[PDB]
Structures are given as structure tokens and as C-alpha cells.
Amino acid sequence: GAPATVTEQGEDITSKKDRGVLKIVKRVGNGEETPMIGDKVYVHYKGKLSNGKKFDSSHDRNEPFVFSLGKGQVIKAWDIGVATMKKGEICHLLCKPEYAYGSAGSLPKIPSNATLFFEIELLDFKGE
Numbered sequence: 001g002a003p004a005t006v007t008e009q010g011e012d013i014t015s016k017k018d019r020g021v022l023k024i025v026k027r028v029g030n031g032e033e034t035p036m037i038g039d040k041v042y043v044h045y046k047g048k049l050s051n052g053k054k055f056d057s058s059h060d061r062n063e064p065f066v067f068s069l070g071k072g073q074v075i076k077a078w079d080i081g082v083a084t085m086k087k088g089e090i091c092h093l094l095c096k097p098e099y100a101y102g103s104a105g106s107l108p109k110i111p112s113n114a115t116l117f118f119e120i121e122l123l124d125f126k127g128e
């Protein structure tokens, strides 16, 4: 499975090194630069619970998902994960609940202590 591969081959990109955000590069991006805090980032993504449930994709609404990086506009995994990406990169992220919705979850969609899996493509990033 796409999740287990991240469990097995993924790099722990967390600061505390608690394996709470694991990353695999599936497609290498351009050049060397990676986004700054406050950069307006554009992505397409596909995501779901680790168990395959609650699938969501930006593609099926024909629009890039946009947010400001490192400002807490998204789950912690996304701020940590997207900051490591190069433009045009595609990566897979496995995100423990501590770096997503925690014990509370977000009902009715996200249950308590859900692990989330994402495929993220970094389309672009520009300055604050």
C-alpha cells in the first residue's frame, strides 16, 4: 500500500524525530529552492485516512489548493512537509494524529487519533 511504503521507506522530517511526519519523494522537483514561511503556496493533493476512508482531492474541484506556509493555516504535517518540497516535486506524507487532528479528531469526518496519508504536488510558491 501507498501508506505502508511511507512507513517503511519514508524519512522522518519532524524536529522531535518521533516519526510523526514521514516523507517519500515520488517525483523530484526543479532546482534547489524550497518555500519560506509566509510564502503563498499552490498545490494539488490527494489525501485520505490511512485505512483508505474519507478520500479528498483538489483535482476533482479543478483548482489548486492555496495557503500561506508556516502560519498554522493547515495541519502541522503540511507546514512541516511542504516547507521541504521543491517546485514541481511530488511527495507522499504519512501524518500521525499528533501532527493532524489529534485525539479530538474533527467529527463527523475525522475520527479520534486518525493517521492521514497525502500525496502532494508543489506547483508554485511566491513571497509574502
Ligand SMILES: COc1ccc(CC[C@@H](OC(=O)[C@@H]2CCCCN2C(=O)[C@@H](C2CCCCC2)[C@@H](C)O)c2cccc(OCCN3CCOCC3)c2)cc1OC
Pocket (backbone or CB within 6 Å): 045, 046, 047, 048, 049, 054, 055, 056, 065, 066, 067, 068, 072, 073, 074, 075, 076, 078, 100, 101, 109, 110, 116
Ligand atoms: C493545526 O491547524 C489547523 C488548521 C486548519 C485546519 C483545517 C483543515 C485544513 O485542511 C488541512 O489541514 C488538511 C491539509 C490541506 C488539505 C485539506 N486538509 C484536510 O485535512 C482535509 C482532508 C481530511 C481527510 C483526509 C484528506 C484531507 C479536510 C479539510 O477535509 C483546511 C481545510 C480547508 C481550507 C484550509 O485553509 C485554506 C487556506 N487559507 C485559510 C485562510 O483563508 C485563506 C485560505 C485549511 C486544521 C488544523 O489542525 C487541526
